[PDB]
Structures are given as structure tokens and as C-alpha cells.
Design a protein around this ligand. Structure first.
Ligand SMILES: Cc1ncc(COP(=O)(O)O)c(CN[C@@H](C)C(=O)O)c1O
Ligand SMILES: Cc1ncc(COP(=O)(O)O)c(CN[C@@H](C)C(=O)O)c1O
Ligand SMILES: [Zn+2]
Ligand SMILES: [Zn+2]
Lengths: 135, 405, 405, 137
């Protein structure tokens, strides 16, 4: 049913987001989902070629905020190229595509379900687009 | 009067399934569906007599031209405009309002002049004026709103001054459902030496329009919201004002004489219709007008008021739902569930086959005025039933229970 | 795919006009539609009509996927680099007016020149007339050779370092000439100018590659390429569209809307204000699929063959002047001695044949030809050599009828 | 055939027009047919409420020029806004409906035939359209 979209891990990241805040000497971009109900401000401090820490502030639907939490936590210590590869994998994931399961997504995999709810793709995609404009 | 079963039978799109549920379409405020009458009008046009219009010499050309101009006459009667000279076919309400802002506003604003609008306005009735004032050095002013989301005539009298040249206001709010006092506002505008521009995108499909009684100087409408084809709308303007406005576009059809460096314009209304016009769309809008007239706009209004009252009463028996706007309203309800973001509400409703809109419904300043980031909105039209209201309310209750157990 | 199959796909062809088989030779005014396109519109209005973009229900998703997929189809059809450079408009006239409003008026001072041709359609004349008139710039005309072609030497003489814009039709709707658009783009760029191509008449009949043409702007109309009325395309180089202000303001084209300021959406939606032409754009995508399956190269080869056949048959009839050069598109503009083209068109229509008579929205060209009006038969993918034979026989009946008086 | 509703007298007025020329010190209206190709420059010099002389010059089809010619000769010396009444009668005549027949209505009438071939209505109405803008204040 609806339970194949609002999976337990998603609802947990919605209730208890992980990297909540806007932090210091950093690259900070903000985003808004076209249907203005999802707002994100992404904060990333980059260590030469890797992302040492990422945090976010926002207000929006369950899917957008949970995706922001899961993404920010799945990018800690990963490289820029690994991060963009994750983003491309996620974009394929929200369409029909096969995708390369090499590279762990962790909890992010749970958003597979909103492939069957295309009206929320940008909901889940907002966060990641913040990253692609970050670089 | 309205037999809802017969009415619905004519709308093929209504009789389908979405996620194993009967479609419950409550998004007519975003766009309307089309009866067989209209779709078959388009079919017959493209199957039998498609040809270019006006400049034409052959049989099919004459048939297509008679169709297009007959649709113009149908619109004129539909809104009770004095003359065909005052009916201009456009791309839609947005294009109509932009034509007013381009051709009228920029030629009649100097520094010190004011454009007076509303907090409830659709973006279509906000941004053009923003640009116009900024090009002319004029000033944009906002009529404030009451707690219940209505406008008091007194606030209008306070806001509009002798410096006001243009007052622009939506006939019906697509968010609040308010029916604005357009007649009295037109009188206030005229008493202060101003013209009134009415965004009538949301009223035209649901209410009889009489531009002579309203005494509005401009009136904008969209076909796609009144059972008509996409891509066509109407700009009405008092003949005397259109006479002294420059065209908004330049090209074929709209000219009389063309020299190498200068040209004269055609008489109204063709002055404002550059290039090959929206032929099929205009003919289909005429068909949609015939359909709605045969049903009766007053009967459509009665049906929507009954459904609006029924929906409001059923909504107040739902706890943890805020409804925005006043008691007396058009056929729409904009609301929010506590602790359930409208995107999630829309996903659950669509999972039960129900179609509603979520977001700022193109009224960002109004969202700020309500101190909210987004809303959900169910809208009603001639084909909607009380049963669909029941399905909507039960689905909202399932949404509440689903997100909070 | 044979000619008979192609005609079999166009329902409008198979009917009688004044007890004769319809002979439609007015595709240069507008084209007819194949079953594919009409059924595309039918399926849209029957199954998945809803508003596009910001919406959250199933039907909305289907309609949005359809609209944006049509945009992708257009982009591939004309070989534009990016979707960001494909803007859906009302038609070629609106596209050219957008260029004149947003680009021309922001980049002309006194001293600047806009350079056009004597052969130009009114759509590609009047907007520039207005732009130069608002900016204090100067309009200049590239002369034509006696045969009605353009010389590259004439353009190099006309275009100077002061030229900011060169606007030229890809194919003349009167002369049938195919202008050297690529070399003209080269000359425009060498003199510090951009080139705007009116491609209303080329797009339906020949492959368009905007990258090879290197044109800065390109305008086209759906109704001339087997597509629905009321929709067209503006193509512009991405870098230029980035720095042009929107032509219209309203919903859909914004990012944020405050009371006094608003930010614009990224391309291409920056230039698409309000509810877009949903069904029309989807149907234009269907028409592009249809034309691609046939092949634009086969359509061009077929039209040349019929143009050559028509010319050879034409001048071996005495007392007809054909205007323009030997190599031409699929159209012939002509005159019979002492019979005004209106009377010719009425006799031809009495034999079921549809042609256009008069100006063809190119008054200065009429002045250049020292004629008050002309007759024009145009060809498209569904026309035959037999219909050319019927046209010549009817022209002969016209002459003999107007000699018996 | 059916095209013999190209009446014999109409062909006389296209052949040898009546009031071809200019009229100075008077009211000058100029019009082009929506269906491009017919041009009229209608000039009327009037003696108060009547048109003492009406002349036209133009270029166009048989029907437009013939209607202008017949018009200028049936409107030489016309009375009050009865001229507008003639115009409404002519417009009804081209839509097939019968009229208040014989308020003189000199000549013409053969244009009754282009109640058929509606693509030529505009051709015949050009001249009369000029008149209606001539009087428009
Ligand atoms: C009150 C109102 N005003 C103006 C417009 C602009 O009309 P077009 O988009 O047809 O040009 C709309 C369209 N409605 C959509 C955008 C909505 O708000 O649901 C509207 O509902
Ligand atoms: C060369 C040319 N340019 C521009 C246009 C304007 O197109 P739209 O009106 O669809 O925007 C036309 C239309 N064709 C008609 C008028 C003809 O050739 O007779 C054309 O032939
Ligand atoms: Zn969301
Ligand atoms: Zn004529």
C-alpha cells in the first residue's frame, strides 16, 4: 500500500533527522522544491577533495526531509566523485533504471519506493540537487 | 435542473481507475475536464474544415473563418459585452493580464501614479504590475484583508486615492474561495479616476459574468478552466480603452497598411490578434460556452454552493483541520491537516484515487499572509458529487490516522 | 510509405467541395492533420488532461510527462543543444515578437541597425519596425535580385559594423526561395550582429539543424507542419536566452514572488507564463513523430519534384507569370492576365481547388513585384501530380470563362 | 454554370467603372479588404447631409471594384443616415435574409448572388465598409 513508500527507516529519519543545522566556514546553498513546501539549506565543509561534514536546515514534507537526513549522513567522509556518483545512482533509482548497486547507499535505498510515486521524485530529489549545485 | 449522472456521463476522463480506485477529480480550480461536446468540436474541426482564417478564398477557409468569428460572437454574448470589438482571443488569462500591463499600464503610468492590487492575488495578477510600475516609476499598493480573508469596501476606499490609475483584483480567489465585490470596487475605482482590471479566471467557469453590470474596464478569462481547450483565453476591454491602446504584438492579421518603415493597425478586435489565431481552440471554447449555457451557469453556481456548504460542514467535524477563508465561498476548500505536510496529504489522497492540489496555488504573498508554507486544496465543478466529498473526507481521516498512530 | 497511404492518413482530404474531389493546395497558409495528431489530442482530452508541473496527482504526472516529452521531441527535431533553448509559444508571430521585445529593445541604441529583406513576411517586419521605433535605431532592407533571390554581396553591402540584428525568413512564402541562412549567419556574426530566422515555411518541409545553421534565433509554427493550431516554438542560443528578460509575467515562470519583487525560473520555463498550451504542444510532438517517420528528406524531395512538374506545366500555359527562381520550395506564386486572383480562386474553388489570393502577408514584396495581388498554390506531403493537372485544367477553364465576357 | 451569378451588369461595372477618380475638399477614407488584395480609396464631397459627389479609385477583383462602382453611382445624391440603412440592408442581403425591398436601392442587387460563394462577401462589402467608417464621427 502506502507502506511501500513510507518505509520505517524513512519515517524514522523524518521524525529524527540526523545532520540538523547550518554550520560555519562552509559552502552553503539553499533550495526549494517547485511546489513550494520543501525548503532546504545545505551546509557542507569540504576538506580538499572530500566532505568532512555536511549538515542541513529545512522544513517540508516527510520524503524531502528524510531524504535530506539520509543523504547528509551518507556523504560524511566520502569523496566528491563518489558523492556525485551516489547522486547519479539516486536519480536513476527514482526513475525505472537498473542502477549500479556497487557503492553502498545505506538507508537511502529505502527511497526506492517513491519510484512508484513520481509526484514526490522532486520531493526526494531536492536534497541531492542541493549537492549538485554545491559543487 | 442539473442531473449529475447525465452531466458526468459526458466526461470520459472521469470514468477510469487510479491505483485501483474510482477517480475522484477535485482539482478543477487548476484545470477542468472536457465534455464530449467540446472534444468532438475539435475532432470535427480537424476532420472536416481546418483551413486558415480571414485571408482565405476557398470553401474550407470560409467554414473555418465563420467558426472562429462565430466563437467570438458566442463569447461576447456569454459575458454580455456590448460589442464584438471588445472581445480579444488570447493564449489565456496570463497573456490577457500581461497585455493590459504592456499596452495600457505602461502608457498611463507616470511617477506618482498608483497601481492598487490585493494580498490574495494570483501571480498572474501581481507580477505584470510589478514590472509595469517599475518601468514607469509608479507605485504598487496592496488592499489589506480581513481576518476571514475577505476584503472590506472600506479598506478599498482607504487604499484607492486620486493618484490611483489602475485597480486590479481577482473576481474569485482560487485559494480563499472569496467572491470579491467587483461591482462596488469598479465604482470606487471610477470615483478616483482609475480603471479596474478583473482577473476572472476563477469566476467565469462557475458563475454568470455580465461585464456591463460589473462595469469592469478589463476582464481576463481562461478556456481550460471552463470545460474548454487548453491554450486559449479571452481579454475583454471597454471599446473606448482598446481604441487608444497600442497592440501587444505585431505581425500578420493585425495590420491594415504596411510601408517599409511604418504600418497602420486593423480595427478592433483584430488589432490585438497577431498571426494565425488559435483557431481550433477558439471554436472549442465556443462549444464549451454552448455546453455550459445549456446547463445554466446559475444552476452550476447553485450546485457548487451546495457542495461547498456540505464540504465545509463535514470539514468542521474533522478535528485537526484548518480551513482557510470565509463561510460564503465558491466551490473550493483550501485546508491543512495538523502535523501532516500537504505533500503527504496529496500522496495519500491520490493513493485513494483523489486528485487535489498542494502548494502555494500560485499565491505566494497570500501564503505569507496566512503564515504557512503550503496548503492542500480540493475544488469542485459541475461533475462533482456529495459522494466524492465523502470519499475526500474519509481519505483525509485515513491520512490523519496513517501519519499518527 | 506510398503517396496513397500518406493521403489515407488525412481524413480532411476525403470529401467533396462543390461536387469535386477536394484539391487542397494551400498548405503554405496551413497544413492538414494526420489521424496520428488528431487522436493524440483525443487521447489527451479523454484520458489524462490535468494541469502541468506543480501538481501531485496521477493525471497531472501523465500530462506533465507528455508536455515535457514534447519539448524534448522538438529539441531533437531541430537539433538544439539543450531543452533550455526550446520555448513553447503561440506561434511564429509570438516567437518573433518575443525576440523583438526581450532582445531587440534591450540591445538597440541610436546608430544601431536592424537588417531585414523585401521578401519578409509581416511577422518578420512589423516587430522590428516597432523595436527600432522605440529605441531610435534604424531599419535597413537587403535588396533582392530581379529574380527575387538574395545575393551574399548585397547582404555584405547592407550589413555593417553598426548592425545589431539581421532578421530573414528561411524560405519565402511567396517566392519559394531558400535563403542562404548559414552564410547570412556568418556575415551577421562577422559584423557583430545576431541573426533571427523566420522558419515558419522551412520547418514543415525540410530538415532543420539549428547547430549547423548557427542561427541565434529560430521561430516556427505547429499549424503549418501537420500540428495543432495555437502552438509554435521559439529557439534561441542558451547564452542569449539567459540574459533576456521574460516577455510575460505570471505563474509557472517564477521562482519566488514577493509583494514588490520576483525572481525568474531557469530556462526554458522563464519564458512560459501561465497554464501552457498543453494539448497543442503534445500534439505538435505527435506531428513531429509523424513527419520524422516519413522523413523530412523524402518530403523535401517529393515537394521539389512537384514544384518542378508544376513550373514546367505552368509556362507552357501562356498568359501566366510565375514569380521567383527555378530552384524553389513546394509553392508557386502566379498571375493570369486580366483576371484578378480573387476571381481565379473562386473558379478554382468551384472546381474544388483551394489556393490563396492576395498579399500573403508580404505587402512590401507585392510593391517590389509591381503587383497588387497574386495567386498561390502550395504543395505538401499529401499532394499529387494529378492535383497539379487538375489545377492547370482549372486555370484554363478560368481563362476561357473570363474570355466569354 | 453556378458562376453565372457573376451578373452581366456587374461585369459592366468592372469593365467600365462609374465614379473613378479623386474628390478634393472632402471626406477621404481608405480601406483594404480583410481578404487582402482589394484596395479602395473612397472620397466623398458632401453638401450637408447628402453626398453631392462620391468617387473612388482602387485595385482589386471584379466584385469589389464593381460593388464600389455601382455603390458610388447609387450613392451619388443619397439622403440621410438612410445610407446606413442601405448598408444594413446590403449586409442582410449577403446573409441571405430578405430586406425592406425598394427604398430605391438603385442598381446593384445582382450582388445578391454572392450570398453564395461566401468567400467573396468581404469583396462586395469593402466599398460599403468604407462608407460606414466615412460617417463614423
Ligand atoms: C484565480 C486565477 N487567476 C489567474 C490564473 C492564470 O490563468 P492561466 O494560467 O490559465 O493563464 C489562474 C489559473 N489557475 C492556476 C494557475 C491555479 O492557480 O490553479 C487562476 O486560477
Ligand atoms: C513565411 C511566413 N512567416 C511567418 C508566418 C506567421 O506564422 P503564424 O501566423 O502561424 O504565426 C507565416 C504564416 N503563413 C501565412 C500567413 C501565409 O503564408 O499566407 C509564413 O508563411
Ligand atoms: Zn515535498
Ligand atoms: Zn476581392
Amino acid at each position: 500500500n502506502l507502506d511501500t513508500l513510507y518505509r520505517q527507516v524513512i519515517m524514522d529519519h523524518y521524525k529524527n533527522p540526523r545532520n540538523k543545522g547550518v554550520l560555519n566556514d562552509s559552502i552553503v546553498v539553499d533550495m526549494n522544491n517547485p511546489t513550494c513546501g520543501d525548503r532546504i539549506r545545505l551546509t557542507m565543509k569540504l576538506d580538499g577533495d572530500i566532505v568532512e561534514d555536511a549538515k542541513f536546515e529545512g522544513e517540508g514534507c516527510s520524503i524531502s526531509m528524510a531524504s535530506a537526513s539520509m543523504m547528509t549522513q551518507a556523504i560524511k567522509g566520502k569523496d566528491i566523485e563518489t558523492a556525485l556518483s551516489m547522486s547519479k545512482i539516486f536519480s536513476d533509482m527514482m526513475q525505472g533504471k537498473e542502477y549500479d548497486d556497487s557503492i553502498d547507499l545505506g538507508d537511502i535505498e529505502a527511497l526506492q519506493g517513491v519510484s512508484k510515486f513520481p509526484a514526490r521524485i522532486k520531493c526526494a530529489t531536492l536534497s541531492w540537487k542541493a549537492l549538485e549545485k554545491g559543487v | 435542473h442539473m442531473n449529475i449522472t447525465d452531466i458526468r456521463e459526458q466526461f470520459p476522463i472521469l470514468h477510469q481507475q487510479v491505483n485501483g480506485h474510482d477517480l475522484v477529480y477535485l482539482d478543477s480550480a487548476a484545470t477542468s475536464q472536457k465534455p464530449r461536446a467540446v472534444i468532438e468540436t475539435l475532432d470535427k474541426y480537424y476532420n472536416q474544415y481546418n483551413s486558415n482564417v480571414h485571408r482565405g478564398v476557398h470553401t474550407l477557409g470560409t467554414r473555418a473563418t465563420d467558426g472562429y468569428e462565430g466563437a467570438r460572437e458566442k463569447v461576447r454574448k456569454f459575458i454580455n459585452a456590448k460589442s464584438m470589438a471588445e472581445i480579444i482571443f488570447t493564449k489565456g488569462t496570463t497573456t490577457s493580464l500581461n497585455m493590459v500591463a504592456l499596452s495600457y499600464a505602461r502608457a498611463n503610468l507616470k511617477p506618482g501614479d498608483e497601481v492598487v492590487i490585493t494580498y490574495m492575488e494570483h501571480h498572474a495578477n501581481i507580477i505584470p504590475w510589478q514590472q509595469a510600475v517599475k518601468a514607469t516609476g509608479a507605485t504598487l499598493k496592496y488592499i489589506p484583508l480581513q481576518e476571514d480573508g475577505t476584503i472590506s469596501l472600506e479598506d478599498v476606499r482607504e487604499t484607492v486615492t486620486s493618484n490611483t490609475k489602475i485597480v486590479a483584483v481577482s473576481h474569485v480567489s482560487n485559494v480563499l474561495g472569496t467572491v470579491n465585490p467587483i461591482k462596488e470596487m469598479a465604482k470606487i475605482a471610477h470615483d478616483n479616476g482609475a480603471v479596474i482590471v478583473v482577473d476572472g479566471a476563477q469566476s467565469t467557469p462557475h458563475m454568470k459574468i455580465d461585464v456591463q453590470d460589473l462595469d469592469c474596464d478589463f476582464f481576463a478569462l481562461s478556456s481550460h478552466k471552463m470545460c474548454g481547450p487548453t491554450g486559449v483565453g479571452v481579454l475583454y476591454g471597454k471599446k473606448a480603452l482598446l481604441e487608444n491602446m497600442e497592440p501587444a504584438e505585431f505581425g500578420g492579421e493585425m495590420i491594415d497598411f504596411v510601408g517599409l518603415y511604418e504600418s497602420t493597425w486593423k480595427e478592433l478586435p483584430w488589432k490585438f490578434e497577431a498571426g494565425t489565431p488559435i483557431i481550433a481552440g477558439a471554436i472549442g471554447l465556443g462549444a464549451a460556452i454552448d455546453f455550459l449555457e445549456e446547463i445554466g451557469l446559475d444552476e452550476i453556481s447553485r450546485h457548487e454552493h451546495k457542495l461547498a456548504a456540505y464540504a465545509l460542514e463535514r470539514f468542521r467535524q474533522l478535528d485537526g483541520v484548518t480551513v482557510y477563508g470565509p463561510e460564503e465561498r465558491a466551490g473550493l476548500v483550501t485546508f491543512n491537516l495538523d502535523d501532516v505536510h500537504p505533500h503527504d496529504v496529496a500522496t495519500v489522497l491520490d493513493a485513494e484515487g483523489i486528485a487535489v492540489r498542494a502548494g502555494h496555488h500560485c499565491a505566494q504573498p497570500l501564503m505569507k499572509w496566512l503564515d504557512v508554507t503550503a496548503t492542500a486544496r480540493a475544488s469542485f465543478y459541475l461533475y462533482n458529487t456529495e459522494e466524492e466529498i465523502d470519499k475526500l473526507v474519509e481519505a483525509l481521516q485515513k491520512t490523519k490516522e496513517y501519519f499518527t498512530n
